[PDB]
Amino acid sequence: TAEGVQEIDYKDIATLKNYITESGKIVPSRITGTRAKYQRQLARAIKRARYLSLLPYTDRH
Amino acid sequence: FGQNFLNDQFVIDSIVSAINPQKGQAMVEIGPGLAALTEPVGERLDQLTVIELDRDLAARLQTHPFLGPKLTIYQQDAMTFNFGELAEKMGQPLRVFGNLPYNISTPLMFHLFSYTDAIADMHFMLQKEVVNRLVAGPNSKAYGRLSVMAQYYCNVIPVLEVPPSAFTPPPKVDSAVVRLVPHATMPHPVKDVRVLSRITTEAFNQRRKTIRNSLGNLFSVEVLTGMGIDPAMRAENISVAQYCQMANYLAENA
Amino acid sequence: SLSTEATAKIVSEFGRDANDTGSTEVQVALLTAQINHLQGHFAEHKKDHHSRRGLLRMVSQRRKLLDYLKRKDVARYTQLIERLGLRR
Amino acid sequence: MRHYEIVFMVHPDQSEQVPGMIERYTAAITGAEGKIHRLEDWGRRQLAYPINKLHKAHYVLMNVEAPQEVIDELETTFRFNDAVIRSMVMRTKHAVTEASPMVKAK
Amino acid sequence: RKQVSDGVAHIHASFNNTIVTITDRQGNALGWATAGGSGFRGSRKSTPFAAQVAAERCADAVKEYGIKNLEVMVKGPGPGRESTIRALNAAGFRITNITDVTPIPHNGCRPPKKRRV
RNA sequence: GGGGGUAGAAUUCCAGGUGUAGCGGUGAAAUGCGUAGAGAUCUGGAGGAAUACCGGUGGCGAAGGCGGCCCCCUGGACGAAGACUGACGCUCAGGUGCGAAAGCGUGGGGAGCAAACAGGAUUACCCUGGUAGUCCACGCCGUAAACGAUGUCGACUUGGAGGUUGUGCCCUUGAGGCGUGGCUUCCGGAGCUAACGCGUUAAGUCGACCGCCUGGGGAGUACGGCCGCAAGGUUAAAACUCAAAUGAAU
After folding, report:
1. Where, if anywhere, are coiled coils annotated (chain A) (predicted)?
2. For residues B95 and B114, what is the distance between their CA atoms, to the nearest angstrom?
3. Which chains are within 8 Å of C by 3+ CB pairs?
């Protein structure tokens, strides 16, 4: 799952697309049922990938 | 909405005694209302000139039981007209008083200070917060624009305090009576009064900083040193006479 | 914080051997090392109070250890404060 | 002496002059005893939003062990160079050598 | 004075008015109508009825070019958000897409003093 | 915690396009903006302040407090196994330091908001502009319902539901079983309490040291000292006056 048994890479777009909504926001942990620690890692990875233009900030076009 | 008239009889004896209205003086008591303040005028004045903004009150005010034909009634707003017109009609400065809504009691005296001589003395009852500022002096926290402007025209003397429980639906504030009577001569005359207002407003708009930059939008340090004004004191430390000094200078020079 | 090599060198110098790491002399030396290093950091970042609060703890602990050493043995105390430049 | 991970992307039009950049940077890193544990080129990749009127870019990933000075030098050259549009260096706990999932999927 | 086969409907559904503007791919406007410029005033100016009246008026104002298809962009939370698209497709228009465009800041400037009511 | 870079949304302004007559605001209007083309919609730039989603009843800090991403310098807490010193401890009057917001001094900056001020209305509150200020560097000020209204340290005394963060052992698809630590939220037993309530994170049972209280008003006021550029802070009475003032529950 999201909690890979090691760490969460920020170069894995295929996995990171599971935890974002259509608009590109991050899905809260209530819906996914993921641990808090790995949720924090998720947020950091998604933000980093957003900086490098590997994911959309919102939906400009 | 509801106003709160004066009911207690013990308090309104001092007011009547303090005014001491005799015969031969022009009394212009605005807003009689229920005549709560003119009924204790039963020593009478053989005449009085009354001003009432409401026709309904004026209509059901022309007869009373005894009032009838002693007074002339005007139905225009006091803030609008020329008091001095009714000054050569009789020939003497008018003696007036009122119990107006504190709300509207401020603009009238500044509409009355212009007409000067047509006015001899005044006895109004105002809020305690405001009365203290009027009679205040420098180096306090009750010192302000109102004090300087009023003290430039007339003399301010408190007359009577009204504890809050004297009026029906009594408020949360205390009222007071002050006696003001315009000066016979100006201790410090100023060519243009509006420039004096300009200076005082600008100085007291930054009441908490030094005048080197509070009032430095118009002046310079060496100029204020010329007139002997310390450039490192707050606006509340400047005496009225000093405030008339740069009032004169700003017109004498450019 | 101190590097592991610097800590090991100080321990080897002041200690009885390579495992006596809890003697008063070694502790005072380690604290002095840290203090001397941190003046350089605080010369540049003077507006950083939250770490100056730990530097003060270092200084106070060193003073308490020195007083205990004074009362226990005097000659060792004199030799130590001469060896480290403490108290002029 | 620390481990880093540098990722930078370059103008698609200058996608042919990257070898010189890579060679220069490799020489600079290795000159000061630093090692290189992983070096990858993803080629041209389509951008996810228009970075100042462009689309697509040439992507470079490179894992390094090195001291602070060479990294500051690399940062300064990136800042002063023009063909590079966006770069990012990260510190990492320890060395890695396994290829990115990105290369394998391609 | 020119035939186009695509169009964009923009509505500004504020809390005090509504404005509908028709434009092309490049964003060059064709015709516009306002709820308050259709003989409405006062609270009546914010009612959905004025919105549909302005929608019809603007539709009639853009048939000289022969528009047959467009999609709608909504910008605002106010009333009149939905009546306009209905009155528009009732005037010979096909709705390809419906989009919400109202901006949201990521904590930008500070907002005014809210209604102490 | 200190320093330096950088990104994307939004508001305002500027310059360009398409376009024609209203926009904004209110309970209704007016001041106001516009035919020198507004408002609307698309393209480019300038500048300042703040970091949506994640976000939690979650985490860190002595308290005040701390929120985009990356690097450099740096303080504390916790856990595993082993080694070392040998009472090196606890508390602390005077003293020293840190300390929201507002406010001040010298010099910058100024997009949004907005005391004062300038206008327009209605019978308070409302609407349109808008200065100080909010921001930065360096000094001052030293106060808050600065609150858990609960001083710091140590030991002992039945339980039940949750959250967050380490670690040992077995077989091992392990979110599989048996343990062992730290911090934190809610119920409730004995006991305590005027009651409300607290209840192993005590307001229970004890020991060490410190601060403070003595009917209500006058009064945290006056006079004096110390501190401050100023505003003011701190230490701190009496004459007189009343027979009450107060807390919890019914």
Report:
1. none
2. 16
3. none
Resolution in A: 2.8
The residue behind tokens 């002096």 is: B137
Q: Which nucleotide is nearest, taking the CA of residue D88 and each C1'?
A: F70
What is the side-by-side order of every strand in the sheet holding B94-98? B94-98, B119-127, B175-182, B154-162
Q: Are residues B225 and B241 in the same domain?
A: yes
Q: What is the CA radius of gyration of chain B?
A: 21
Do strands B94-98 and E69-74 pair parallel, antiparallel, or not at all (unpaired)? unpaired
Instruction: Name the residue type at position B196.
Output: L
Walk across the sheet containing E8-11 and list its strands: E29-34, E19-23, E8-11, E69-74, E94-100
Residues β-bridged to residue B123: B97, B179
Cα–Cα distance, B98 to B103 (Å, whole number): 13
Which residue segment(s) compose the domain that C67 sits in?
A: 1-88
Same domain, B146 and B191: no
Tokens found for residue B125: 């009852």
The experimental method is cryo-EM
Side-chain-side CA neighbours of D38 within 13 Å: the count stands at: 19
- Quickly give A35 CA vs F159 C1' distance in Å: 30
Q: Do D48 and A51 touch (CB under 8 A)?
A: no
Nucleotide nearest to E34 (CA to C1'): F22
**Mutation site, A44, A53, A61, interface D, largest D CB count within 10 A:** A53
Boundaries of domain holding E63: 2-117
Q: Identify the DSSP state of E111.
A: P
The nucleotides of chain F lying under 7 Å from a protein CB are 1-3, 7-11, 17-29, 39-45, 48-56, 58, 61-63, 68-76, 83-85, 87-89, 97-99, 103-107, 111-118, 123-127, 131-132, 138-139, 163-166, 175, 229-232
In this complex, which residue's CA is closest to the C1' atom of nucleotide F74?
C51
DSSP-derived 3-state class of residue B91: coil
**CA nearest to B143, candidates B204, B70, B226:** B204
Contact D29, D64 (CB under 8 A): yes
Domains held by chain E: number: 1
Structure tokens given for D54: 């462009």
SS3 state of residue E9? strand
Q: What is the rounded distance in angstroms from the CA atom of residue E95 to the CA atom of residue E69?
A: 7
State the nucleotide closest to E110 in CA–C1' terms.
F112
Residue labelled with tokens 């709300």: B103
What's the distance, Cα to Cα, between the start and end of chain E in Å?
A: 52
Evaluated on CA atoms B240, B246, B251, B252, the torsion sign reads positive
Q: Assess whether chains A and D touch, using the rule of 3 or more C-beta pairs within 8 angstroms.
A: yes
Q: By residue range, what is the domain housing residue B2?
A: 1-186
C87 CA to F207 C1' in angstroms comes to 39
* Chain D residues inside the 8 Å CB shell of A9: 101
